């Protein structure tokens, strides 16, 4: 089934400039209090999450280094310690992960 006639620019404009076709303005956008970058509500802030993910990756690299090879998951809990930190009574009997940097403010 082929078009019987060429559709005009007038009719085409009516189709493609319809509100239905148009991009809708978003009202979800707020400033993240932590970093000041824009976040959509209901969604984790991209900047803050990227920061957390970078740190998580570093810790995981260290975890892999200590484990050595595959199929070496520990049968005890894990704890991450930074520079100038010692294991506590709770941290005793846990796997210790050492980081070469200082504690982040957000990490508690």
């Amino acid at each position: 089934a082929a078009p019987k006639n060429r559709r005009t620019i007038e009719v085409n404009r009516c189709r493609r400039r319809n509100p239905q076709k148009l991009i809708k303005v978003k009202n979800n956008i707020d400033v993240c209090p932590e970093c000041g970058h824009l976040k959509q509500k209901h969604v984790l802030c991209a900047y803050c999450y990227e920061k957390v993910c970078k740190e998580t990756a570093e810790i995981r690299r260290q975890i892999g280094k200590q484990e050595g090879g595959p199929f070496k998951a520990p049968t005890i809990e894990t704890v991450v310690l930074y520079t100038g930190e010692t294991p506590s009574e709770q941290d005793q009997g846990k796997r210790i992960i050492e980081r070469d940097r200082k504690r982040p403010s957000w990490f508690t």
Binding site: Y47, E50, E55
Partner: protein, 173 residues
Amino acid sequence: IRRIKDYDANFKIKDFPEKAKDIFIEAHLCLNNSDHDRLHTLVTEHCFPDMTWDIKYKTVRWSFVESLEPSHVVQVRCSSMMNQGNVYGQITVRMHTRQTLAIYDRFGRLMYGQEDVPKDVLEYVVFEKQLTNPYGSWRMHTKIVPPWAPPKQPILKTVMIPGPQLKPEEEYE
């Protein structure tokens, strides 16, 4: 100055401040009318970009009023023959003058200075000429800024000096 005179055969130090003043004023005047052809004759190739590059896409209303103190030569130096067939002579002149300056935008909105009110200014201006080269003339080469110089008049615009833009992994100090 003996090294300059031997090439020139006819040079007067006593007359030079008057010439220097004329060159200076004419160069600064042609900035207003944006005649680069005349500027090239009056201004050294080193000096040209220094006084031209920022002036692009904006209007200057520089003017000269009476000088408080007559200009005088302070230092005379010459080249040490770095290039064959090239000798350069430099004269430094002290100028204590009153001047008016108004700088505007593309859009004609005033950026800097006030049109009517004159301001006192003390400047060291060094002039360079290429000797051993015919058709050569004394041209404004550089302005020396003293370390003890008073700060320039403040701009009308308020500016923001941005802090260090940091990647997520980076931590502020």
